[PDB]
Amino acid sequence: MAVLVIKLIPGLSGDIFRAAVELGYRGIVIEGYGAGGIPYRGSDLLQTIEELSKEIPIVMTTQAMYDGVDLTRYKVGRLALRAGVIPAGDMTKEATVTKLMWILGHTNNVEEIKVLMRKNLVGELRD
Amino acid sequence: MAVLVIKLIPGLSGDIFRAAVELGYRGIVIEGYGAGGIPYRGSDLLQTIEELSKEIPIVMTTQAMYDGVDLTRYKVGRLALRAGVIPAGDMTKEATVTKLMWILGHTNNVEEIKVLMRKNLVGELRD
Amino acid sequence: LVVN
Amino acid sequence: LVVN
Amino acid sequence: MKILLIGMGGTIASVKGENGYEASLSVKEVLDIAGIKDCEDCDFLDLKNVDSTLIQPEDWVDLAETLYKNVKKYDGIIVTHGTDTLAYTSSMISFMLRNPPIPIVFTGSMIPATEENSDAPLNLQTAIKFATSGIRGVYVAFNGKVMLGVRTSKVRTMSRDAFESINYPIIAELRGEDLVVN
Amino acid sequence: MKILLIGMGGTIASVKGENGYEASLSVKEVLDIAGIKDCEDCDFLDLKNVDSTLIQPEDWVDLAETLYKNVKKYDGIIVTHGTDTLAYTSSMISFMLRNPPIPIVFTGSMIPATEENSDAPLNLQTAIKFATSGIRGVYVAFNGKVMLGVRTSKVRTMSRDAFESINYPIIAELRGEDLVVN
Ligand SMILES: [Cl-]
Ligand SMILES: [Cl-]
Ligand SMILES: [Cl-]
Ligand SMILES: [Cl-]
């Protein structure tokens, strides 16, 4: 049920993500800068997410209002995908979070949540 | 130095805010729905923030792109102010967070941080 | 609902 | 910088 | 023909008193104060009367159940709601009710219907026209525009033009007395 | 007259190789590839060469120090940067350098200067014209528009029109060869 949405800012550590998981959060949304990607330069964030994305779904949206994410566009983005991050494609922020919450009401299988999040259920997503 | 930005979503608990503080975060930004306000109905969030805003600055912005916050506009907003929340007025999200980080580099006095956040330093804010 |  |  | 209006509260239904206490009107009272005269064969149901900032996930379950019980009895449904979490509610309901047989239209207003120059009559009139369109799905009507509910975001905190359709065409837009496709 | 260009890297300076490795060009190379011929009495300084997603607070301290050392030697300064954190960097620098005696203009591009139909030449040309305006402060130039650095947000992830000035008038906008106030 419980989702946590965190905005990516320069210097953000993985420590709050680990605290979230320990608290029993069942999903995390990370609102990134643009097309997507997780910092690894002088940051333990990518390493942390790579570790946690096997345990719970970690979804990436963007702070920008329009055009959505594409983790294939840039190198940092591709790294996030390899780390196990679930892109939100062109979904609104509200649809992304409510969709995740809805899915979490049905399953806890990360790979299953992953395929659901990438599937256009009701018109929220271009898949 | 360390700021955490959390987006307000329905059902968000105060437990992550307490975990943040325990981790040593020196400031928190809560991105609210509209003009501002913290849920108290079937939520421990207002109670939690009322408790924590004496320890660290807790700033409120809005998820909406334009017009900024005004905690005086609605009852839930006024409650947030009484609880000790610092409004971000019409500042961008980027200015809000970098301003807070910059201030935190100089002081840790919450009441001092409070007056700085509400003061137009370089053109970021209508005060 | 419940408020405290 | 440093990357690991 | 046959339309149900469900109240959730919000600014649209707000009245202000002598002191700092606000109170909420019932959905029928809202519509009557808004001056909507064209809404006969309209039923009214009050589900909640809260500021939408206070909306919790339990409320979506209640709304979804009420919607499910009424989709077959009405030709269209309108839900009046606070603007703060309108797009959250409209999004979650879209996931809960995957194949609605009727238009379900979320609306509200930035200025209470009881105030001068309210946006309430425009939004209610927009919602009512769309509710009779025969276009199945979950939508949001605001400032003369109808948007897919799961593609809507609040974009302004202090304007009548509070929402936008994000990465998706506007469904319809009121021009004169006509909703014009896109 | 006398302008310094400081490179931070970003898409603007990107070149792509035979495999999935990208590499970054120096700021002078960017400007040369962009076809800017009007920039003599321009100095070039490469500070970082990173994708802006990787920007960390330490980088702002470095930039601020470099800016502080050069504000008195130049009439204007331009910083080329990735778009992802451009508005963060431009905002923090605004707080660190409260009274800059010259225009300091942040810019970049969504399409690398080495690619076809890049936005780089427009943005560099916009930045250069503003850098000579004599208007003191920290600004962002993008898609022909100059915005207060502390009032700028990235708004699109996949368009040349990537930024907006938020709750504040655009400083100037390129029309023909002229920057027109607002
Ligand atoms: Cl929890
Ligand atoms: Cl930390
Ligand atoms: Cl029916
Ligand atoms: Cl000078």
Distance CA A106, CA E169 (A): 31
Distance CA A90, CA A118 (A): 10
Of the candidates A89, A94, A82, the residue with the CA atom closest to the CA atom of residue B63: A94
Phi, psi of E60 (to 5 degrees): -75, -35
| Residue A14 token pair | 């993985």
Q: Please, what sign has the CA dihedral across residues E159, E165, E166, E170? A: negative
Q: Answer whether A77's CB lies under 8 Å from A102's CB.
A: no
Write out residues 36-95 of B within 8 Å (CB-CB) of E. 37-43, 62-70, 74-76, 78
Q: How far is the CA of B23 from the centre of ligand 2 (A)?
A: 6
| Residue A118 token pair | 């990438």
Q: Please, what sign has the CA dihedral across residues A103, A104, A107, A108? A: positive
- CA distance, residue A32 to nearest chain D CA (Å): 19
- The reply to whether B74 belongs to the active site is yes
What order of strands is seen across the sheet that includes strand E3-9? E42-50, E3-9, E76-80, E103-107, E137-142, E145-148, E172-175, E178-181
Q: Please, what sign has the CA dihedral across residues F9, F14, F18, F20? A: positive
Q: For residue A92, which residues of chain B lie inside 8 Å, CB to CB? A: none
Residue B69 has, within 13 A of its CA and on its CB side, a CA count of 29
Say what the resolution is, in angstroms: 2.0
> Exposed e or buried b for every residue in E57-72, given b needs 16+ CB within 10 A?
bebbeebbebbeebbe
The closest CB to that of F153, out of B68, B94, B98, belongs to: B94
Phi, psi of A19 (to 5 degrees): -65, -35
- Whether residue A67 and residue F156 make contact (CB cut-off 8 A), yes or no, is yes
Q: Could you tell me where the beta strands, DSSP code E, fall in chain A? A: 3-7, 27-32, 58-62, 86-87
Neighbours of F115 (CB within 10 A): 15
Neighbours of E176 (CB within 10 A): 6
Three-class DSSP labels, A41-60: CCCCHHHHHHHHCCCCCEEE
Which ligand does the CA of F1 lie closest to?
4
Kindly give, in sequence order, each residue whose CB lies less than 8 Å from that of residue E121, ignoring residues fewer than 6 positions away: E34, E35, E36, E113
Amino acid (1-letter code) at residue F91: S
Question: Among the CATH numbers 3.40.50.1170, 3.40.50.300, 3.40.1190.20, 3.50.40.10, which is that of F1-182?
Answer: 3.40.50.1170
Give me the residue label for tokens 């499910």: E68
Q: How far is the CA of F102 from the centre of ligand 4 (A)?
A: 6
Query: For A115-121, which contacts have Cβ atoms below 8 Å and span 24 or more sequence positions?
Result: A117/A57, A117/A59, A117/A86, A117/A88, A118/A86, A118/A87, A118/A89, A121/E95, A121/E98
- Whether residue A4 and residue B4 make contact (CB cut-off 8 A), yes or no, is no
∠ CA F32-F36-F39, rounded to 5°: 100
Q: Which of F59, F61, F150 to mutate to test the interface with B (most CBs of B within 10 A)?
A: F150
Q: For residue B42, which residues of chain C lie inside 8 Å, CB to CB? A: 1-3
Of the candidates A87, A107, A91, A98, the residue with the CA atom closest to the CA atom of residue A30: A87
Residue F136 has, within 13 A of its CA and on its CB side, a CA count of 9
User: Length of chain F in residues, anyone?
Assistant: 182
Distance CA B38, CA B26 (A): 20
| Residue E10 token pair | 């919000």
Q: How far is the CA of F98 from the centre of ligand 4 (A)?
A: 15
Domain that holds residue B26: 1-127
Q: How far is the CA of E66 from the centre of ligand 3 (A)?
A: 14
Alpha helical stretches, state H, chain E: 27-33, 57-70, 86-96, 120-131
Give me the residue label for tokens 């305006």: F133
Neighbours of B14 (CB within 10 A): 18
Neighbours of B13 (CB within 10 A): 16
CATH number of the domain to which A42 belongs: 3.40.50.40
Q: For residue E167, which residues of chain A lie inside 8 Å, CB to CB? A: 66-68, 90, 92, 126
Q: Answer whether A85's CB lies under 8 Å from A71's CB.
A: yes
Give CA torsion, residues E44, E50, E53, E59, to 10 deg: -70
Of the candidates B59, B58, B56, the residue with the CA atom closest to the CA atom of residue B22: B56
Alpha-carbon distances of E133 from E6, E102, E104, E174, rounded to whole Å: 18, 9, 11, 13
B60's enclosing H/E stretch is: strand B58-62
Which ligand does the CA of B21 lie closest to?
2
Reduced to 3 states, what is the DSSP secondary structure of residue B62? Answer: strand
Distance CA E130, CA E120 (A): 15
Reduced to 3 states, what is the DSSP secondary structure of residue E4? Answer: strand
Reduced to 3 states, what is the DSSP secondary structure of residue F85? Answer: coil
Distance CA A27, CA A110 (A): 9
Give me the residue label for tokens 């909640």: E48
Distance of CA F95 to the CA centre of its chain: 17
Neighbours of F20 (CB within 10 A): 8
Distance CA E96, CA E98 (A): 6
Three-class DSSP labels, F134-174: CCCEEEEEECCEEEEHHHEEECECCCCCCEEECCCCCCEEE
Which ligand does the CA of F71 lie closest to?
4
B in contact with E (at least 3 C-beta pairs within 8 A): yes
Phi, psi of F77 (to 5 degrees): -130, 140
Reduced to 3 states, what is the DSSP secondary structure of residue B66? Answer: strand
DSSP-based helix, strand, coil % in chain F, nearest 5: 30, 30, 40
The closest CB to that of A92, out of E137, E138, E153, belongs to: E153
Neighbours of E28 (CB within 10 A): 16
Q: Answer whether E45's CB lies under 8 Å from E80's CB.
A: no
Reduced to 3 states, what is the DSSP secondary structure of residue F43? Answer: strand
What is the Cα Rg of chain E in Å? 15
Alpha-carbon distances of E68 from E31, E64, E131, F102, rounded to whole Å: 23, 6, 16, 63
Domain boundaries, chain E: 1-182
Domain count, chain A: 1
DSSP, res A111: H
Q: Please, what sign has the CA dihedral across residues E150, E162, B49, B122? A: positive
- CA distance, residue F110 to nearest chain B CA (Å): 20
